[PDB]
Design an enzyme around this catalytic site. Structure first.
Site, PDB file in Angstrom:
ATOM      1  N   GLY A   3       6.085  -3.826  10.330  1.00  0.00           N
ATOM      2  CA  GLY A   3       4.760  -3.277  10.152  1.00  0.00           C
ATOM      3  C   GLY A   3       4.235  -2.540  11.367  1.00  0.00           C
ATOM      4  CD  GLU A  13      -3.314  -0.533   6.314  1.00  0.00           C
ATOM      5  OE1 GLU A  13      -2.228   0.066   6.446  1.00  0.00           O
ATOM      6  OE2 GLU A  13      -3.537  -1.335   5.385  1.00  0.00           O
ATOM      7  CB  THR A  28      -1.738  -3.948  11.458  1.00  0.00           C
ATOM      8  OG1 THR A  28      -2.121  -2.668  10.955  1.00  0.00           O
ATOM      9  CG2 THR A  28      -2.929  -4.583  12.124  1.00  0.00           C
ATOM     10  CG  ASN A  67       9.888  -8.956   1.705  1.00  0.00           C
ATOM     11  OD1 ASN A  67      10.428  -8.822   2.799  1.00  0.00           O
ATOM     12  ND2 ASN A  67       8.572  -8.974   1.552  1.00  0.00           N
ATOM     13  N   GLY A 118      -2.133  -7.435   9.639  1.00  0.00           N
ATOM     14  CA  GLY A 118      -1.226  -6.631   8.847  1.00  0.00           C
ATOM     15  C   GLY A 118      -1.683  -6.565   7.407  1.00  0.00           C
ATOM     16  CD  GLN A 119      -1.303  -2.852   2.561  1.00  0.00           C
ATOM     17  OE1 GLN A 119      -0.760  -1.984   3.239  1.00  0.00           O
ATOM     18  NE2 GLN A 119      -1.696  -2.645   1.316  1.00  0.00           N
ATOM     19  CD  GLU A 169       6.341 -36.052  18.943  1.00  0.00           C
ATOM     20  OE1 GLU A 169       6.298 -35.466  20.043  1.00  0.00           O
ATOM     21  OE2 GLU A 169       7.101 -37.020  18.730  1.00  0.00           O
ATOM     22  CE1 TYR A 187       5.612  -6.964  -1.778  1.00  0.00           C
ATOM     23  CE2 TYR A 187       3.916  -5.316  -1.428  1.00  0.00           C
ATOM     24  CZ  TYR A 187       5.207  -5.762  -1.251  1.00  0.00           C
ATOM     25  OH  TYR A 187       6.101  -4.995  -0.547  1.00  0.00           O
TER      26      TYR A 187
HETATM   27  N1  LIG Z   1       4.913 -10.807   0.183  1.00  0.00           N
HETATM   28  C1  LIG Z   1       4.189  -9.734   0.472  1.00  0.00           C
HETATM   29  N2  LIG Z   1       4.664  -8.815   1.381  1.00  0.00           N
HETATM   30  C2  LIG Z   1       3.935  -7.722   1.680  1.00  0.00           C
HETATM   31  C3  LIG Z   1       2.711  -7.512   1.080  1.00  0.00           C
HETATM   32  N3  LIG Z   1       2.209  -6.358   1.557  1.00  0.00           N
HETATM   33  C4  LIG Z   1       3.082  -5.836   2.446  1.00  0.00           C
HETATM   34  N4  LIG Z   1       4.157  -6.674   2.522  1.00  0.00           N
HETATM   35  C5  LIG Z   1       5.346  -6.504   3.362  1.00  0.00           C
HETATM   36  O1  LIG Z   1       5.004  -6.033   4.648  1.00  0.00           O
HETATM   37  C6  LIG Z   1       6.075  -5.255   5.133  1.00  0.00           C
HETATM   38  C7  LIG Z   1       5.609  -4.277   6.196  1.00  0.00           C
HETATM   39  O2  LIG Z   1       4.390  -4.743   6.709  1.00  0.00           O
HETATM   40  P1  LIG Z   1       3.042  -3.967   6.324  1.00  0.00           P
HETATM   41  O3  LIG Z   1       1.902  -4.913   6.038  1.00  0.00           O
HETATM   42  O4  LIG Z   1       3.327  -3.050   5.163  1.00  0.00           O
HETATM   43  O5  LIG Z   1       2.772  -3.121   7.652  1.00  0.00           O
HETATM   44  P2  LIG Z   1       2.067  -1.683   7.658  1.00  0.00           P
HETATM   45  O6  LIG Z   1       2.737  -0.687   6.747  1.00  0.00           O
HETATM   46  O7  LIG Z   1       2.008  -1.174   9.072  1.00  0.00           O
HETATM   47  O8  LIG Z   1       0.579  -2.024   7.181  1.00  0.00           O
HETATM   48  P3  LIG Z   1      -0.371  -2.717   8.264  1.00  0.00           P
HETATM   49  O9  LIG Z   1       0.405  -3.769   9.010  1.00  0.00           O
HETATM   50  O10 LIG Z   1      -1.578  -3.336   7.608  1.00  0.00           O
HETATM   51  O11 LIG Z   1      -0.820  -1.645   9.222  1.00  0.00           O
HETATM   52  C8  LIG Z   1       6.616  -4.547   3.912  1.00  0.00           C
HETATM   53  O12 LIG Z   1       8.016  -4.441   3.996  1.00  0.00           O
HETATM   54  C9  LIG Z   1       6.232  -5.437   2.753  1.00  0.00           C
HETATM   55  O13 LIG Z   1       7.375  -6.026   2.186  1.00  0.00           O
HETATM   56  C10 LIG Z   1       2.229  -8.436   0.173  1.00  0.00           C
HETATM   57  O14 LIG Z   1       1.147  -8.251  -0.371  1.00  0.00           O
HETATM   58  N5  LIG Z   1       2.973  -9.546  -0.140  1.00  0.00           N
HETATM   59 MG   LIG Z   2      -1.295  -1.784   6.197  1.00  0.00          MG
END
Ligand SMILES: Nc1nc2c(ncn2[C@@H]2O[C@H](COP(=O)(O)OP(=O)(O)OP(=O)(O)O)[C@@H](O)[C@H]2O)c(=O)[nH]1
Ligand SMILES: [Mg+2]
Ligand SMILES: Nc1nc2c(ncn2[C@@H]2O[C@H](COP(=O)(O)OP(=O)(O)O)[C@@H](O)[C@H]2O)c(=O)[nH]1
Lengths: 421, 428, 315
Positions: free
Chosen positions: B132, B60, B134, B195, B9-10, B243, B213
């Protein structure tokens, strides 16, 4: 991760002329095609919009097409006419004369085979295609005529790519030609079914924006096409430049299309300022405002389904999202009830040159049925007389086809009233 | 005595930028991999380089290049930085089936390669989200094969919970119900993070009105160091993560704890209060520092871990843990009398050079299982239910290969989870 | 009508199913309600408009269904029935049956009996023209003769198809040959499992003008394909078939939910089928949805998914 860009019509080729002017300056690319920027981020995603040729040359992923040379005669002679390789200038003579069936049903269609092979060799050069991007109007002959014909063959050929287009809509103000409601109702018979998204744009709202916000006296076609091109880069550069929430066009597409026919948007640039503060609450108020709506609709008279808020620059997330949350808190009636969070954000780390922040309102409201009511009511009185119709019937168009065009358009009106309340 | 770390994921990848930011600072390890002048999360080369036990995978290609062009690119081995070409498009059907199938065969071998390089594997911890594409789709496909091939290993999930009000995508409740069905069957202990409370702790206790972030994940990375990277070191009362599941998860399906962290402070206000172990344990049980936006007073408690750092006298802790039962406004189940596992590691809390957490001598991370979470699930289930009532946005999924009966099916297993959290509290 | 005709029919056991000696999982109470057990071991109840068990006659399942449905086609209105289900022997025995014996034939020749029963009953200008078209790969294919496009013609809601081949036949065995002519040109996809996977949503149109004045009657026979999963298919071309099948069903599944809530604007243009079949489901018409099933323990997840497509919310 590459997007094909094609420009058609007298309108869109003027728009794309100022568009590639922006992207070249976004990376320090010379009008000839040499890189003179200073960042690797300028250097990293050039392939998304350009083909790297030898000697550090950069030809844009851009195809110019019309039935009349005169616009491209000005462009190729004008600035940024040398950045193209001259292969891309696919056109002919004997323009459509703002006739849809001349642009679509007949002659204009004869040029299409010469176009799509240039589309093919460009798309074969892409290692990973990502989508297509068009620039045209609705009420134009060589804009809507081939503009519907080109996207029909492409979506048949590329059923997986993202089909975005920037589309200039006829106004309640100007009737440049009187056949403008006839051209729109034929194009919407194709635009609903063959694209994944589009952007409705009126000249009149950009006339309003350069008047009441930019305070500029005579907004020329250079200024409005400068104005719409900012949202064009505003959409795609989050995919290219690094960001916190980097979102694909498909990540917009699954976020903004609740029903497979409703994919029309009202884009809007946030930090529109005259030459006489700048925070995220400063930005989002300009995002929310009805004056910044680049379509000639009252969004407060409508109701919103989904809002895309693409951002650019160094901004704290909570500073955005709490301010994003307050927008739903003030007017909760303005959003639809069956969607709990109606707004999506996207924050790019890199702002454009000059301004430290910029945002982009992209909304899907129920105000768009108003602009559909202008075309359909203009369709009705003209179809009763069949006024100036014998050109198209002489070109081989049946009245049932026009009747099936407006009813399919009337199908599209009845969705937004259904989902408004 | 080793553990693996996947980031997908991102979200969980950008968290993993901050996790390995601590562990190199844990031992004076450079971004190179050597110490200028411990075999748990690394593999030392003959040249003195230490490669992490980390794999970073995403659809990505954006955020991966931020790692392998920014800092720490000399740290990970480049065979580990698995990279897709096309996005997840925020579709579960893309990550779980459509796109992620064509990468996971490369991904699973690297886990299989590193597990062969490991000996005495404790399991592994993954990093993802819930809303998300991914980090909900592909990680659902990921923990399927891992539950098959490694049936005996501990699977930990540092997921990001979808917050009630602040949400960044409209399809977030649509993917959480899909994620939890894959999660509930195979995940052994999955942590959620909201968050909004990361904002709430930082805007009040850290006094930072501009969190990015980066600033959130320094708190999140500090907790993961407290769970694992401390507890693979010497302490007075060390506890292993094997455990945990018998200490913390009383049933098959109750494995959803809440982490928090009490000594969160700015550089200035730590000069005022000398942090004792008594006030810190009370600071864990505050409703305002829960790290997931739920009301703990409205939920009964079952079990509660307290993992410690730095100089701590256990005799004070036994008074401090008696103080919580003395200050009994918590609700505790009649099932469990003594749901308080103490663990004290000798290692201090470490500071990140750039973060705004002061150098405290002692730190406590608290894990807890409460029945307040059914209130949290009821919010996401309402957000799902209206969209499926309209069949909103579903054509991006059934146009990608899912069935409309399955989203009804996955809600019932989410609804079956809501029956259990009602059952565990009502019993006497 | 206001109340949608939600039905389900159970097929009887096969002899190869008796070689496995598998136990039944279906419990018949009446023609209205039939209990469907589930051993995992929670016996569930699924209440519908009417339910036919495994030991049910083909005339009997028709007379409850096709015999109230037929006369509203000729009395001004029109009527429509669907055939939803996966590949199985229960699907064929519903529509055409065996066929044989003039009673145990399926819903089609029992109707084709009762059509030609009406031709001899009263005497009007019966003109029975029939087209038969499928949806293979999002295009409407003329199964009778595909020699470029299928074009839809629309004053309030009445949709005519151009490119279809309406055949004015007037004997029962004629369309019995045409369905054999329909299946030979119908596209199937060879596979290790279910090679006869000729998966297509398919309409079969019986329009009979019965004028004297002008009196029209249209009957539609919908052959729905079964909803599948792309993961269970395990096929690397078949997916484009599969995801367009399921998405067409859900748009069809959307609009029926847009019917029962008396929603103001029912959408039609989003899928080609309900755009081609607008007034047939929408009006003061009577829509019978059919779900076929085979008992035992094999298609259990396929069984419970059909009930979600069959379950409606009522006050
Ligand atoms: N704490 C933190 N949360 C993040 C960050 N980047 C994304 N998020 C959280 O991830 C949540 C959704 O997951 P994403 O990673 O955006 O999923 P996505 O849009 O499909 O992107 P990918 O999973 O990479 O495909 C969002 O609501 C964000 O709050 C980060 O850098 N730090
Ligand atoms: Mg992403
Ligand atoms: N903003 C802008 N709009 C234009 C420009 N040129 C034409 N248009 C719009 O395009 C519409 C006419 O369509 P046009 O492209 O000329 O038809 P075509 O030549 O047959 O393709 C008019 O309503 C104009 O508002 C331009 O340079 N800038």
């Amino acid at each position: 991760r590459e997007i094909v860009h094609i420009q058609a019509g007298q309108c869109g080729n003027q728009i794309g002329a100022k568009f590639w002017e922006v992207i070249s300056d976004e990376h320090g690319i010379d009008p000839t095609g040499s890189y003179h920027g200073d960042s690797d981020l300028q250097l990293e995603r050039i392939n998304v919009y350009y083909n790297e040729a030898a000697g550090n040359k950069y030809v844009p992923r851009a195809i110019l097409v019309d039935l009349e040379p005169g616009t491209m005669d000005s462009v190729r002679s004008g600035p940024f006419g040398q950045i193209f390789r001259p292969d891309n200038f696919v056109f002919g003579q004997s323009g459509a004369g703002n006739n849809w069936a001349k642009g679509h049903y007949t002659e204009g269609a004869e040029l299409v085979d010469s176009v799509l092979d240039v589309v093919r060799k460009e798309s074969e050069s892409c290692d990973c295609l990502q989508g297509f991007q068009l620039t045209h109007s609705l009420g134009g002959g060589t804009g809507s005529g081939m503009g519907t014909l080109l996207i029909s063959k492409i979506r048949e050929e590329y059923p997986d790519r993202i089909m975005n287009t920037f589309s200039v809509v006829p106004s309640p103000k100007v009737s440049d030609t009187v056949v403008e409601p006839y051209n729109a109702t034929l194009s919407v018979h194709q635009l609903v079914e063959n694209t994944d998204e589009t952007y409705c744009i009126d000249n009149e709202a950009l006339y309003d924006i350069c008047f009441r916000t930019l305070k500029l006296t005579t907004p020329t076609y250079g200024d409005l096409n400068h104005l719409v091109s900012a949202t064009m880069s505003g959409v795609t550069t989050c995919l290219r430049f690094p960001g916190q929430l980097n979102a694909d066009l498909r990540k917009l597409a699954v976020n903004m299309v609740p029903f497979p026919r409703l994919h029309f948007f009202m884009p809007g640039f946030a930090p529109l300022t005259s030459r006489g503060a700048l925070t995220v609450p400063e930005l989002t108020q300009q995002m929310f405002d009805a004056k910044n709506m680049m379509a000639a609709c009252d969004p407060r008279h409508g109701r919103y389904l989904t809002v895309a808020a693409v951002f650019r620059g160094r901004m704290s997330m909570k500073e955005v999202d709490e301010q994003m949350l307050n927008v739903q808190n003030k007017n909760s009636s303005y959003f639809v009830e069956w969607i709990p969070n109606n707004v999506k954000t996207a924050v790019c780390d890199i702002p454009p040159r000059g301004l430290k922040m910029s945002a982009t309102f992209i909304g899907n409201s129920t105000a768009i049925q108003e602009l559909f009511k202008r075309i359909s009511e203009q369709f009705t009185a003209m179809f009763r007389r069949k006024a100036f119709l014998h050109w198209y019937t002489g070109e081989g168009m049946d009245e049932m086809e026009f009747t099936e065009a407006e009813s399919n358009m009337n199908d599209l009106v009845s969705e937004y009233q259904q989902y408004q309340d | 005595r080793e553990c693996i770390s996947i980031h997908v994921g991102q979200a969980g990848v950008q968290i993993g930028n901050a996790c390995w930011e601590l562990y190199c600072l844990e031992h004076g390890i450079q971004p190179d991999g050597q110490m200028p002048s411990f075999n748990t999360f690394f593999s030392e080369t003959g040249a003195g380089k230490h490669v992490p036990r980390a794999v970073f995978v995403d659809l990505e290609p954006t955020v991966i290049d931020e790692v392998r062009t920014g800092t720490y690119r000399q740290l990970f081995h480049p065979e580990q930085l698995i990279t897709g070409k096309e996005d997840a498009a925020n579709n579960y059907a893309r990550g779980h089936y459509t796109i992620g199938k064509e990468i996971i065969d490369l991904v699973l071998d690297r886990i299989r390669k590193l597990a062969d390089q490991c000996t005495g594997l404790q399991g592994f911890s993954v990093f993802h989200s819930f809303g998300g594409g991914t980090g909900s789709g592909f990680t659902s496909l990921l923990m399927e094969r891992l539950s098959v091939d490694y049936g005996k290993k501990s699977k930990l999930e540092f997921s990001i919970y979808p917050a009630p009000q602040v949400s960044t995508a409209v399809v977030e409740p649509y993917n959480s119900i899909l994620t939890t069905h894959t999660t509930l069957e195979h995940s052994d202990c999955a942590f959620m993070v909201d968050n909004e409370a990361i904002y709430d702790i930082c805007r009040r206790n850290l006094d930072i009105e501009r969190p990015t972030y980066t600033n959130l994940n320094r708190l999140i990375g500090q907790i993961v160091s407290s769970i694992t990277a401390s507890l693979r070191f010497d302490g007075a009362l060390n506890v292993d993560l094997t455990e945990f599941q018998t200490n913390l998860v009383p049933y098959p399906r109750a494995h959803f704890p809440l982490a928090t962290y009490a000594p969160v402070i700015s550089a200035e206000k730590a000069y005022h209060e000398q942090l004792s172990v008594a006030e810190i344990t009370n600071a864990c049980f505050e409703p305002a520092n829960q790290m997931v936006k739920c009301d703990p007073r409205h939920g009964k408690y079952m079990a509660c871990c307290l993992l410690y750092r730095g100089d701590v006298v256990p005799k004070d802790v036994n008074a401090a843990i008696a103080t919580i039962k003395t200050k009994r406004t918590i609700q505790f189940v009649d099932w469990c009398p003594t749901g308080f596992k103490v663990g004290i590691n000798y290692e201090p809390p470490t500071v990140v050079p750039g973060g705004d957490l002061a150098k405290v001598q002692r730190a406590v991370c608290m894990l807890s299982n409460t029945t307040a979470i059914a209130e949290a699930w009821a919010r996401l289930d309402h957000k799902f239910d209206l969209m499926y009532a309209k069949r909103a946005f579903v054509h991006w999924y059934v146009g990608e290969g899912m069935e409309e009966g399955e989203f009804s099916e996955a809600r019932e297993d989410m609804a079956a989870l809501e029956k259990d959290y009602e059952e565990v509290g009502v019993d006497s | 009508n206001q109340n949608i005709q939600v039905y389900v029919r159970v097929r009887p056991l096969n002899s190869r199913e008796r070689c496995i000696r598998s136990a039944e999982v279906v419990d018949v109470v009446g023609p209205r309600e039939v209990v469907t057990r589930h051993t995992l071991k929670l016996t569930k109840k699924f209440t519908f408009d009417r339910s036919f068990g495994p030991e049910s006659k083909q005339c009997d399942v028709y007379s409850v269904v096709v015999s109230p449905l037929i006369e509203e086609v000729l009395n001004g209105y029109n009527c429509t029935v669907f055939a939803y289900g996966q590949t199985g022997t229960g699907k064929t025995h519903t529509m055409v049956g065996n066929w044989e014996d003039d009673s145990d034939i399926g819903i089609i020749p029992r109707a084709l009996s009762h059509l030609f029963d009406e031709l001899r009953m009263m005497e009007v200008e019966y003109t029975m023209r029939i087209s038969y078209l499928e949806l293979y790969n999002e295009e409407l294919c003329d199964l009778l003769s595909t020699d470029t496009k299928i074009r839809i013609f629309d004053k309030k809601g009445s949709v005519i198809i151009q490119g279809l081949e309406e055949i004015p036949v007037h004997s029962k065995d004629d369309v019995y040959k045409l369905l054999e002519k329909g299946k030979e040109r119908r596209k199937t996809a060879t596979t290790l499992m279910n090679a006869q996977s000729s998966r297509s949503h398919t309409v079969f149109s019986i329009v009979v003008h019965i004028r004297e004045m002008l009196k029209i009657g249209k009957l539609n026979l919908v052959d729905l394909a079964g909803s599948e999963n792309v993961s269970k298919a395990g096929n690397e071309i078949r997916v484009r078939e599969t995801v367009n099948i399921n998405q067409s069903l859900l748009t069809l599944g959307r609009v029926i939910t847009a019917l029962v809530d008396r929603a103001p604007h029912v959408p039609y243009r989003e899928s080609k089928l309900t755009r081609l079949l607008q007034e047939s489901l929408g009006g003061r018409t009577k829509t019978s949805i059919i779900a076929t099933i085979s008992p035992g323990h094999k298609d259990i997840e396929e069984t419970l998914s059909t009930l979600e497509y069959a379950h409606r919310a009522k006050n």
